[PDB]
Amino acid sequence: APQEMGDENAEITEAMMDEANEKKGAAIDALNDGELQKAIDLFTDAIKLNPRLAILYAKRASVFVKLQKPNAAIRDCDRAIEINPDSAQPYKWRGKAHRLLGHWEEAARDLALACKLDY
């Protein structure tokens, strides 16, 4: 079953960008507490409010990996890469999710990229 990805063609106000950072702060607080479902919900709220911020999809992917929902992670990473092809985070989580699945060649591809992109 698939997760909410948010409307890619939305008009995004300064107000919405701010509330998104608020939901992100709370998602991060839940994550660090090991309340992982809660973290997903809160990243999902963040994504509906700023669906063009790549870091939000990457963070949610990382949570999906900790929950061992690798396909869900891969969907989030693809979307983050499509917004920002040159940032390291989504390749890392996509590589890790590919490992759970035993997609060894894909995982090494992505993890190799993550290492180079990271600086």
Short mmCIF file of all heavy atoms in Angstrom, two decimals, residues 51-83:
data_model
loop_
_atom_site.label_atom_id
_atom_site.label_comp_id
_atom_site.label_asym_id
_atom_site.label_seq_id
_atom_site.Cartn_x
_atom_site.Cartn_y
_atom_site.Cartn_z
N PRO A 51 5.85 20.21 -0.62
CA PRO A 51 6.11 18.98 -1.36
C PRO A 51 7.28 19.09 -2.34
O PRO A 51 7.56 18.13 -3.06
CB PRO A 51 4.79 18.72 -2.10
CG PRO A 51 3.93 19.97 -1.90
CD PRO A 51 4.77 21.00 -1.23
N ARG A 52 7.95 20.24 -2.37
CA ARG A 52 9.15 20.40 -3.22
C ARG A 52 10.48 20.52 -2.46
O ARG A 52 11.49 20.94 -3.04
CB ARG A 52 8.98 21.55 -4.22
CG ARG A 52 8.01 21.21 -5.34
CD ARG A 52 8.30 21.95 -6.65
NE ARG A 52 7.90 23.36 -6.65
CZ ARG A 52 6.66 23.82 -6.45
NH1 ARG A 52 5.65 23.00 -6.20
NH2 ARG A 52 6.44 25.13 -6.49
N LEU A 53 10.48 20.15 -1.18
CA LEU A 53 11.70 20.16 -0.37
C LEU A 53 12.31 18.75 -0.24
O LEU A 53 11.79 17.90 0.49
CB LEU A 53 11.43 20.78 1.01
CG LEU A 53 12.61 21.13 1.94
CD1 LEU A 53 13.61 22.09 1.27
CD2 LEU A 53 12.12 21.72 3.26
N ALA A 54 13.42 18.50 -0.94
CA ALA A 54 13.98 17.15 -1.08
C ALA A 54 14.34 16.48 0.26
O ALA A 54 14.16 15.26 0.42
CB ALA A 54 15.18 17.14 -2.03
N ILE A 55 14.84 17.28 1.21
CA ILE A 55 15.28 16.78 2.52
C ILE A 55 14.13 16.10 3.29
O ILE A 55 14.36 15.11 4.00
CB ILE A 55 16.02 17.89 3.35
CG1 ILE A 55 16.81 17.30 4.52
CG2 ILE A 55 15.03 18.92 3.89
CD1 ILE A 55 17.63 15.99 4.18
N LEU A 56 12.90 16.58 3.10
CA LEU A 56 11.73 15.98 3.75
C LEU A 56 11.45 14.55 3.29
O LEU A 56 11.06 13.71 4.10
CB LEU A 56 10.48 16.83 3.54
CG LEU A 56 10.49 18.25 4.09
CD1 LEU A 56 9.12 18.90 3.88
CD2 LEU A 56 10.91 18.28 5.56
N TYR A 57 11.64 14.29 2.01
CA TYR A 57 11.46 12.93 1.48
C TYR A 57 12.60 12.02 1.91
O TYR A 57 12.37 10.85 2.23
CB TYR A 57 11.41 12.95 -0.04
CG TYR A 57 10.17 13.58 -0.58
CD1 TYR A 57 10.17 14.91 -0.97
CD2 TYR A 57 8.99 12.84 -0.72
CE1 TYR A 57 9.03 15.49 -1.49
CE2 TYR A 57 7.84 13.42 -1.23
CZ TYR A 57 7.87 14.75 -1.62
OH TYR A 57 6.75 15.33 -2.13
N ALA A 58 13.82 12.56 1.93
CA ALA A 58 14.98 11.80 2.37
C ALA A 58 14.83 11.40 3.84
O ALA A 58 15.01 10.23 4.17
CB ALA A 58 16.30 12.61 2.15
N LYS A 59 14.48 12.35 4.72
CA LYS A 59 14.28 12.02 6.14
C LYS A 59 13.18 10.97 6.31
O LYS A 59 13.34 10.04 7.10
CB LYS A 59 13.97 13.24 7.00
CG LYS A 59 15.04 14.34 7.08
CD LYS A 59 16.33 13.83 7.65
CE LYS A 59 17.09 14.94 8.37
NZ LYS A 59 18.54 14.53 8.50
N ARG A 60 12.08 11.09 5.55
CA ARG A 60 11.01 10.12 5.69
C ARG A 60 11.47 8.74 5.20
O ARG A 60 11.12 7.72 5.78
CB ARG A 60 9.69 10.57 5.02
CG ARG A 60 8.49 9.77 5.53
CD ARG A 60 7.15 10.22 4.97
NE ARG A 60 7.13 10.16 3.51
CZ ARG A 60 6.07 10.44 2.73
NH1 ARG A 60 4.90 10.79 3.26
NH2 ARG A 60 6.20 10.35 1.43
N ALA A 61 12.28 8.71 4.14
CA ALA A 61 12.85 7.47 3.63
C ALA A 61 13.65 6.79 4.73
O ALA A 61 13.47 5.59 4.98
CB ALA A 61 13.71 7.73 2.39
N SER A 62 14.49 7.56 5.41
CA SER A 62 15.32 7.00 6.47
C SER A 62 14.46 6.34 7.52
O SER A 62 14.79 5.23 8.00
CB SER A 62 16.26 8.04 7.09
OG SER A 62 15.57 8.91 7.94
N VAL A 63 13.34 6.98 7.87
CA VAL A 63 12.44 6.34 8.83
C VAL A 63 11.84 5.05 8.26
O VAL A 63 11.88 4.01 8.93
CB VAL A 63 11.33 7.28 9.38
CG1 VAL A 63 10.59 6.58 10.49
CG2 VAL A 63 11.92 8.58 9.89
N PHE A 64 11.32 5.09 7.04
CA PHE A 64 10.81 3.88 6.37
C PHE A 64 11.82 2.71 6.37
O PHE A 64 11.42 1.55 6.55
CB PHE A 64 10.36 4.20 4.94
CG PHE A 64 8.95 4.77 4.84
CD1 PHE A 64 8.67 5.82 3.96
CD2 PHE A 64 7.88 4.20 5.54
CE1 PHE A 64 7.36 6.35 3.83
CE2 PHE A 64 6.57 4.72 5.42
CZ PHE A 64 6.31 5.79 4.55
N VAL A 65 13.12 3.01 6.18
CA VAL A 65 14.21 2.00 6.28
C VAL A 65 14.30 1.41 7.71
O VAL A 65 14.29 0.19 7.89
CB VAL A 65 15.59 2.55 5.77
CG1 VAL A 65 16.75 1.61 6.10
CG2 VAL A 65 15.55 2.81 4.27
N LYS A 66 14.34 2.26 8.72
CA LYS A 66 14.33 1.78 10.12
C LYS A 66 13.12 0.91 10.43
O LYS A 66 13.20 0.02 11.26
CB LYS A 66 14.43 2.94 11.12
CG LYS A 66 15.85 3.48 11.24
CD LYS A 66 15.86 4.98 11.45
CE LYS A 66 17.27 5.50 11.75
NZ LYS A 66 17.49 6.81 11.07
N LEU A 67 12.00 1.17 9.77
CA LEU A 67 10.82 0.34 9.93
C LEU A 67 10.86 -0.85 9.01
O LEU A 67 9.95 -1.68 9.05
CB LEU A 67 9.56 1.14 9.64
CG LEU A 67 9.09 1.98 10.82
CD1 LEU A 67 8.11 3.00 10.31
CD2 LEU A 67 8.46 1.18 11.94
N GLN A 68 11.90 -0.93 8.18
CA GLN A 68 12.03 -2.01 7.21
C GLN A 68 10.84 -2.04 6.25
O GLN A 68 10.18 -3.07 6.05
CB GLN A 68 12.22 -3.38 7.88
CG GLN A 68 13.14 -3.37 9.09
CD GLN A 68 13.94 -4.64 9.19
OE1 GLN A 68 13.51 -5.62 9.80
NE2 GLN A 68 15.11 -4.64 8.57
N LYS A 69 10.57 -0.87 5.68
CA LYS A 69 9.62 -0.75 4.59
C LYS A 69 10.42 -0.21 3.42
O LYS A 69 10.29 0.98 3.05
CB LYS A 69 8.47 0.18 4.96
CG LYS A 69 7.78 -0.19 6.25
CD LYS A 69 6.60 -1.09 6.02
CE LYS A 69 5.54 -0.87 7.12
NZ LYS A 69 5.27 0.59 7.27
N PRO A 70 11.29 -1.08 2.84
CA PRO A 70 12.26 -0.63 1.83
C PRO A 70 11.63 -0.06 0.54
O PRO A 70 12.15 0.89 0.00
CB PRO A 70 13.07 -1.91 1.55
CG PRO A 70 12.14 -3.03 1.94
CD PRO A 70 11.42 -2.51 3.14
N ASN A 71 10.54 -0.64 0.04
CA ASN A 71 9.86 -0.08 -1.13
C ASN A 71 9.35 1.34 -0.89
O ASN A 71 9.51 2.21 -1.75
CB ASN A 71 8.70 -0.96 -1.58
CG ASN A 71 9.17 -2.30 -2.12
OD1 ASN A 71 10.18 -2.40 -2.83
ND2 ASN A 71 8.43 -3.34 -1.78
N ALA A 72 8.75 1.55 0.27
CA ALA A 72 8.30 2.87 0.67
C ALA A 72 9.48 3.85 0.67
O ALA A 72 9.36 4.96 0.15
CB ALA A 72 7.62 2.82 2.05
N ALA A 73 10.61 3.42 1.22
CA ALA A 73 11.85 4.21 1.23
C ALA A 73 12.28 4.57 -0.19
O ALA A 73 12.67 5.73 -0.47
CB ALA A 73 12.97 3.46 1.94
N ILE A 74 12.23 3.57 -1.07
CA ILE A 74 12.69 3.78 -2.44
C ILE A 74 11.81 4.80 -3.19
O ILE A 74 12.34 5.67 -3.89
CB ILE A 74 12.86 2.44 -3.18
CG1 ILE A 74 14.07 1.70 -2.63
CG2 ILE A 74 12.98 2.63 -4.69
CD1 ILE A 74 14.08 0.23 -2.97
N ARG A 75 10.49 4.75 -2.98
CA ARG A 75 9.59 5.77 -3.53
C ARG A 75 9.95 7.18 -3.06
O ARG A 75 9.99 8.12 -3.86
CB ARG A 75 8.15 5.46 -3.17
CG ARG A 75 7.47 4.56 -4.18
CD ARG A 75 5.98 4.31 -3.83
NE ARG A 75 5.75 2.89 -3.54
CZ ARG A 75 5.46 2.37 -2.34
NH1 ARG A 75 5.35 3.13 -1.26
NH2 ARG A 75 5.27 1.06 -2.23
N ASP A 76 10.22 7.34 -1.76
CA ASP A 76 10.60 8.64 -1.23
C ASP A 76 11.93 9.14 -1.77
O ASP A 76 12.05 10.33 -2.10
CB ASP A 76 10.63 8.63 0.31
CG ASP A 76 9.25 8.78 0.91
OD1 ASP A 76 8.29 8.94 0.13
OD2 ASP A 76 9.10 8.74 2.15
N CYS A 77 12.92 8.25 -1.86
CA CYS A 77 14.22 8.59 -2.42
C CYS A 77 14.15 9.00 -3.89
O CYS A 77 14.78 9.97 -4.25
CB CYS A 77 15.23 7.46 -2.24
SG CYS A 77 15.67 7.19 -0.52
N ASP A 78 13.37 8.29 -4.71
CA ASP A 78 13.21 8.67 -6.12
C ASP A 78 12.68 10.09 -6.23
O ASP A 78 13.16 10.89 -7.06
CB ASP A 78 12.29 7.73 -6.88
CG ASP A 78 12.87 6.34 -7.06
OD1 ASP A 78 14.09 6.14 -6.87
OD2 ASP A 78 12.10 5.44 -7.42
N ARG A 79 11.69 10.41 -5.40
CA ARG A 79 11.12 11.73 -5.48
C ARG A 79 12.13 12.81 -5.06
O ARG A 79 12.21 13.86 -5.71
CB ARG A 79 9.81 11.80 -4.72
CG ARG A 79 9.20 13.20 -4.65
CD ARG A 79 8.67 13.79 -5.99
NE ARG A 79 8.10 15.12 -5.70
CZ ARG A 79 8.13 16.18 -6.50
NH1 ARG A 79 8.67 16.12 -7.72
NH2 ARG A 79 7.59 17.33 -6.09
N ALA A 80 12.92 12.53 -4.01
CA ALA A 80 13.94 13.46 -3.54
C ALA A 80 15.05 13.68 -4.57
O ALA A 80 15.52 14.80 -4.77
CB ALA A 80 14.52 13.04 -2.21
N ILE A 81 15.42 12.60 -5.25
CA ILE A 81 16.42 12.68 -6.30
C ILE A 81 15.91 13.45 -7.50
O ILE A 81 16.68 14.14 -8.16
CB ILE A 81 16.90 11.28 -6.70
CG1 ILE A 81 17.93 10.80 -5.68
CG2 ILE A 81 17.41 11.22 -8.18
CD1 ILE A 81 17.83 9.29 -5.40
N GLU A 82 14.63 13.35 -7.77
CA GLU A 82 14.04 14.06 -8.87
C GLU A 82 13.99 15.55 -8.59
O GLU A 82 14.13 16.35 -9.51
CB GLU A 82 12.66 13.49 -9.08
CG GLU A 82 11.81 14.10 -10.12
CD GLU A 82 10.39 13.57 -10.02
OE1 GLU A 82 10.21 12.36 -9.75
OE2 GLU A 82 9.45 14.37 -10.20
N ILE A 83 13.81 15.94 -7.34
CA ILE A 83 13.91 17.37 -6.96
C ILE A 83 15.38 17.83 -6.92
O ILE A 83 15.71 18.90 -7.45
CB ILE A 83 13.29 17.66 -5.58
CG1 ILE A 83 11.79 17.37 -5.58
CG2 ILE A 83 13.61 19.12 -5.11
CD1 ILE A 83 11.27 17.01 -4.17
#
